[PDB]
Write an enzyme that holds these catalytic residues in place. Structure first.
Site, PDB file in Angstrom:
ATOM      1  N   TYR A 176       0.840  -1.190   0.000  1.00  0.00           N
ATOM      2  CA  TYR A 176       0.000   0.000   0.000  1.00  0.00           C
ATOM      3  C   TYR A 176       0.882   1.250   0.000  1.00  0.00           C
ATOM      4  O   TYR A 176       0.639   2.178  -0.778  1.00  0.00           O
ATOM      5  CB  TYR A 176      -0.989  -0.003   1.176  1.00  0.00           C
ATOM      6  CG  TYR A 176      -1.747   1.304   1.267  1.00  0.00           C
ATOM      7  CD1 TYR A 176      -2.752   1.615   0.347  1.00  0.00           C
ATOM      8  CD2 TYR A 176      -1.413   2.253   2.229  1.00  0.00           C
ATOM      9  CE1 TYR A 176      -3.411   2.841   0.393  1.00  0.00           C
ATOM     10  CE2 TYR A 176      -2.080   3.475   2.293  1.00  0.00           C
ATOM     11  CZ  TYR A 176      -3.071   3.756   1.376  1.00  0.00           C
ATOM     12  OH  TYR A 176      -3.710   4.970   1.446  1.00  0.00           O
TER      13      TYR A 176
ATOM     14  N   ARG B 210       1.580   8.473  13.224  1.00  0.00           N
ATOM     15  CA  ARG B 210       1.276   9.702  13.954  1.00  0.00           C
ATOM     16  C   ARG B 210      -0.224   9.983  13.890  1.00  0.00           C
ATOM     17  O   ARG B 210      -0.805  10.513  14.829  1.00  0.00           O
ATOM     18  CB  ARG B 210       2.033  10.883  13.341  1.00  0.00           C
ATOM     19  CG  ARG B 210       1.926  12.196  14.121  1.00  0.00           C
ATOM     20  CD  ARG B 210       2.200  13.406  13.225  1.00  0.00           C
ATOM     21  NE  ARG B 210       1.664  13.200  11.877  1.00  0.00           N
ATOM     22  CZ  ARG B 210       1.793  14.054  10.867  1.00  0.00           C
ATOM     23  NH1 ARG B 210       2.426  15.207  11.036  1.00  0.00           N
ATOM     24  NH2 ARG B 210       1.274  13.763   9.685  1.00  0.00           N
TER      25      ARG B 210
ATOM     26  N   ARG C 290     -11.090   5.841   9.236  1.00  0.00           N
ATOM     27  CA  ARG C 290     -10.055   5.307   8.361  1.00  0.00           C
ATOM     28  C   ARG C 290      -9.193   4.315   9.131  1.00  0.00           C
ATOM     29  O   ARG C 290      -8.964   4.497  10.332  1.00  0.00           O
ATOM     30  CB  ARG C 290      -9.193   6.453   7.827  1.00  0.00           C
ATOM     31  CG  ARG C 290      -9.922   7.311   6.791  1.00  0.00           C
ATOM     32  CD  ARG C 290      -9.068   8.455   6.255  1.00  0.00           C
ATOM     33  NE  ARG C 290      -8.659   9.404   7.291  1.00  0.00           N
ATOM     34  CZ  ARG C 290      -9.410  10.411   7.729  1.00  0.00           C
ATOM     35  NH1 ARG C 290     -10.632  10.590   7.242  1.00  0.00           N
ATOM     36  NH2 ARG C 290      -8.946  11.238   8.660  1.00  0.00           N
TER      37      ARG C 290
ATOM     38  N   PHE D 162      15.216  19.818  -0.584  1.00  0.00           N
ATOM     39  CA  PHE D 162      13.875  19.297  -0.830  1.00  0.00           C
ATOM     40  C   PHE D 162      13.771  17.871  -0.285  1.00  0.00           C
ATOM     41  O   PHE D 162      12.753  17.519   0.309  1.00  0.00           O
ATOM     42  CB  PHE D 162      13.551  19.346  -2.335  1.00  0.00           C
ATOM     43  CG  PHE D 162      12.358  18.517  -2.719  1.00  0.00           C
ATOM     44  CD1 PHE D 162      11.076  19.065  -2.694  1.00  0.00           C
ATOM     45  CD2 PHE D 162      12.513  17.187  -3.079  1.00  0.00           C
ATOM     46  CE1 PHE D 162       9.954  18.291  -3.013  1.00  0.00           C
ATOM     47  CE2 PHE D 162      11.403  16.407  -3.415  1.00  0.00           C
ATOM     48  CZ  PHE D 162      10.121  16.956  -3.378  1.00  0.00           C
TER      49      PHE D 162
END
Ligand SMILES: C=C(CC[C@]12O[C@H](C(=O)O)[C@@](O)(C(=O)O)[C@](C(=O)O)(O1)[C@H](OC(=O)/C=C/[C@@H](C)C[C@@H](C)CC)[C@H]2O)[C@@H](OC(C)=O)[C@H](C)Cc1ccccc1
Ligand SMILES: C=C(CC[C@]12O[C@H](C(=O)O)[C@@](O)(C(=O)O)[C@](C(=O)O)(O1)[C@H](OC(=O)/C=C/[C@@H](C)C[C@@H](C)CC)[C@H]2O)[C@@H](OC(C)=O)[C@H](C)Cc1ccccc1
Ligand SMILES: C=C(CC[C@]12O[C@H](C(=O)O)[C@@](O)(C(=O)O)[C@](C(=O)O)(O1)[C@H](OC(=O)/C=C/[C@@H](C)C[C@@H](C)CC)[C@H]2O)[C@@H](OC(C)=O)[C@H](C)Cc1ccccc1
Ligand SMILES: [Mg+2]
Lengths: 332, 334, 333
Positions: A135, A182, A192, A252
């Site tokens: 997933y 978290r 969910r 980044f």
């Protein structure tokens, strides 16, 4: 170009974590990554929207990669907060089509593969840790791979960066797993379920049971097991970051990884995960003196966080041996 | 080891709380050259600002200041300003100026010559148009950026292209100076000084001092936002200028004040406190504190975080709202 | 290597301030410095332990450098919190003996010399400022020298780094002096005296007299004298840092020096030194946008801290002129 301006407006309006570091990317990477972000955001918005039935949703997920080449395509029925990226999709797709073909190829491939995977998981929860990895690969690993392929295609980074798809996948997995861990409580409240059923069921009958204060001991034990699992990606994160040669790409990539590591350390053995807000408390004095913009600084920051976890490992924790082992490996 | 140079560094530190340390951190010959440039411009600034000096005495002082650099005994003993030690002991400063390589003297004297003329031009008059605002800022700050940029290139620590780009060096100075002028409305009004352009403020109130009155607060904030929007126009040039730099010491010296000015504009945007005193430059977002201002991509990221901090707060009803969005949008897509 | 894994575990468990920067060191420097840390920590643990008689302690300190070569040597009689480095010394010494010979030479040389020096000071306090430098040399300056020799031996830094032992010594003295100054009160209640007697005796009859409220003005004057002494190492610290070419070495060396400078500025003319723990303040605005990972930023941070001290020098302080003079030298250089 007014449509490109609109795309950057949407980027800043939507992304707290990435807008600034994306806009700081050198040269062509900036537009390619801004558009990649917006298009994956549109795809995610479809995935997340529970008002779209599974039967209606699957063909949208499957064909999303092709909607990039349908100039008039938009979606007006979303109930999500970020629906503007779907309603004004033609503006984003126009700017996608203005990217060099080499970038289009990467972004479309990732959208296609992500759509297939997201569709696979609409009807099922995550069961095994192997399924969790699958997933996460679909919704985050593929993002790391796509970004890495863009970095290499741009020539601002070595070809190895886009070729080593396992390392790039780890970059995505570490962030996604950290977010999943978290967000236990917020996800529970939205109905969910992302915590792997094969892990949590070893503790409680129902995943929602971790929100009940009588189950806090077992909750924290499961929390620690999942954190131990996520720590397995850190060696690859260090390897990945160690290969970057462009400062803007390094920033980044490194900043979000360091924020994730900080977050996992704050969550380790922490009852607050199941009770409400977990905020990062300031690090060790030495590491506050550096930022995450050169590799030795990033390593020191990571080592500091690993010790913050290591120090807190309870002897009684069922994962305690495994937590020490992975940290020791990270240190090697 | 030189006693006169030691004295110049003492004066640099007595006068400058925020530039001295980054000047002292500059590589090689740039350190002394910029220390001396700072002190000579400080002496000129002190003359410009001293209201006890009559205009007819002040005009020749400003016009001829560049000549005094070559007059070893020249000093000025009549100032009542707090920084007057640089005028009273000017011979120590000019001696060290004359010890600089000729290439640096030439830049410094040229800037002093041009600044003195510009300063003298504005003694009798207030800033009217936005074009006049740019002119005044050019004289007292743009020329500083241009002079510094020429010193960097003369030293060869920076490429000759840095000193050549006078337009973007000018923008670096304008940005800092406009930010200062915006922030210091109240301090200036209490000192009887007017630096906000009349063509802008007079569209809101009859006198500039009217913004200090609590009944005019909404208008004052609108005018504030209009001037901030004007200043944001220099940011693309600032980014381009900083992007060209290759020396770390020069980069830190140039980039840090620009970031602090952007942080200041963001704290001031749409903020009533500008008209009641001091504005606290706040603590930034999570991503911001992860980086410092010492490499270009980090500087860009900090700038973009501050642009969004402004953008998010633009009020629909503000008369400049579309213009503020427009310039931010341009900065984002550059 | 399970023994190397164990050494890193001990490094992380013991060193709050250095473990992370050591682990970030490039190539062969990482193991060389991790092992250097652990062996010096072991030696320090023996030195510090007041339950070990002088009779037993002298031979331990003198012979420590040779224990590195004795695969079965350990020490089981420590009552110190960090006794694991002693009780499991054979694990540390196995990894020591695996280092390149060039690194072993440096580590064993420093261990030998430090052990000798530590032994000299068992029977005495520090008297003169010269004795203060000697003591700091033994316990910190030699660490700076050893580390610098490892950097040059590894060839990540130029030969000059290990050659210029006076500059490397100053790196160590600056940290050690800052620590001793700061820790006056914690040392006073531990029965420890490190402030040099030739300085403090010009103010009070007994060093512990600085902890008495009535003596605060004299205490602060003495504090300021010692701070002024420590500031004399800053030019050397700047020279040393300016020579480093390796980012990982730079981070390791520069950050402690900046923290020490921040500490001294926080302590300067501050009565709180004698009432407990001193708050290291939020810095001047310009520095808050810089970190300590490039040399011009480190210079600017140091220069700013010097001005924070300068601003606070009161005319009535008996060292005021000396404090201004050293800062003036650092500004102009
Ligand atoms: C939809 C997506 C994200 C949705 C998301 O929603 C938030 C929200 O709706 O609020 C967000 O908008 C916000 O928090 O503001 C946020 C953002 O900031 O961007 O965006 C959030 O960011 C984080 O969570 C980051 C977490 C770690 C870095 C830090 C630590 C603390 C925990 C690990 C994220 O949840 C992704 O796509 C898919 C398929 O997932 C990208 C488009 C993929 C991409 C990323 C980069 C380049 C290109 C593409
Ligand atoms: C007189 C001048 C400035 C007067 C000034 O007075 C202050 C004061 O009187 O108190 C000052 O002394 C102080 O605050 O202490 C200050 C200082 O610190 O130096 O100096 C101030 O500066 C800052 O505060 C800057 C803060 C940035 C870090 C962030 C900002 C820009 C965010 C908004 C400034 O207002 C100039 O000359 C002319 C013609 O203008 C220089 C000589 C020009 C020059 C500059 C550099 C090299 C060479 C020459
Ligand atoms: C024994 C020694 C240290 C004892 C020490 O005990 C602490 C404790 O028992 O708690 C400590 O463990 C802790 O605080 O956790 C600490 C640590 O952090 O390592 O270690 C402490 O350090 C700091 O705090 C330093 C802070 C600067 C970054 C900023 C300061 C200088 C601002 C003022 C220190 O007192 C040395 O050897 C000798 C002979 O002295 C090293 C082995 C020498 C070496 C050093 C580096 C490489 C190789 C060898
Ligand atoms: Mg080499």
């Amino acid at each position: 170009s007014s449509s490109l301006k609109t795309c950057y407006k949407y980027l800043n309006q939507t992304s707290r974590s990435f807008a600034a570091v994306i806009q700081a990317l050198d040269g062509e990477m900036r537009n390619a990554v801004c558009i990649f972000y917006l298009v994956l955001r549109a795809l995610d918005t479809l995935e997340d929207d529970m008002t779209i039935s599974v039967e209606k949703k699957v063909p949208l997920l499957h064909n999303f990669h092709s909607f990039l080449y349908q100039p008039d395509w938009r979606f007006m029925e979303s109930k999500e907060k970020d629906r503007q990226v779907l309603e004004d999709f033609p503006t984003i797709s126009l700017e996608f089509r203005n990217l060099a073909e080499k970038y289009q190829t990467v972004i479309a491939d990732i959208c296609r593969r992500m759509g297939i995977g997201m569709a696979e998981f609409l009807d099922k929860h995550v069961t095994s840790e192997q399924e969790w990895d699958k997933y996460c690969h679909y919704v985050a690993g593929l993002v790391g791979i796509g970004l890495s392929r863009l970095f290499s295609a741009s020539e601002f980074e070595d070809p190895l960066v886009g070729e080593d798809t396992e390392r790039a996948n780890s970059m995505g997995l570490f962030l996604q797993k950290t977010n999943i861990i978290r967000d236990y409580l917020e996800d529970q409240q939205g109905g969910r379920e992302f915590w792997p059923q094969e892990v949590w069921s070893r503790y409680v009958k129902k995943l929602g049971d971790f929100a009940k204060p009588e189950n806090i001991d077992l909750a924290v034990q499961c929390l620690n097991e999942l954190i131990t699992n996520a720590l397995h990606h850190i060696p690859d994160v260090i390897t990945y970051l160690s290969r970057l040669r462009n400062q803007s790409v390094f920033n980044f990539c490194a900043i979000p990884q360091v924020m994730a590591i900080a977050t996992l350390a704050a969550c380790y053995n922490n009852q607050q995960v199941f009770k409400g807000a977990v905020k990062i408390r300031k690090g060790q004095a030495v590491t506050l003196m550096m930022d995450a913009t050169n590799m030795p600084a990033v390593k020191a920051i990571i080592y500091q966080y690993m010790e913050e976890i290591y120090h807190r490992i309870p002897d009684s924790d069922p994962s305690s041996s495994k937590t020490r082992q992975i940290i020791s490996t990270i240190r090697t």
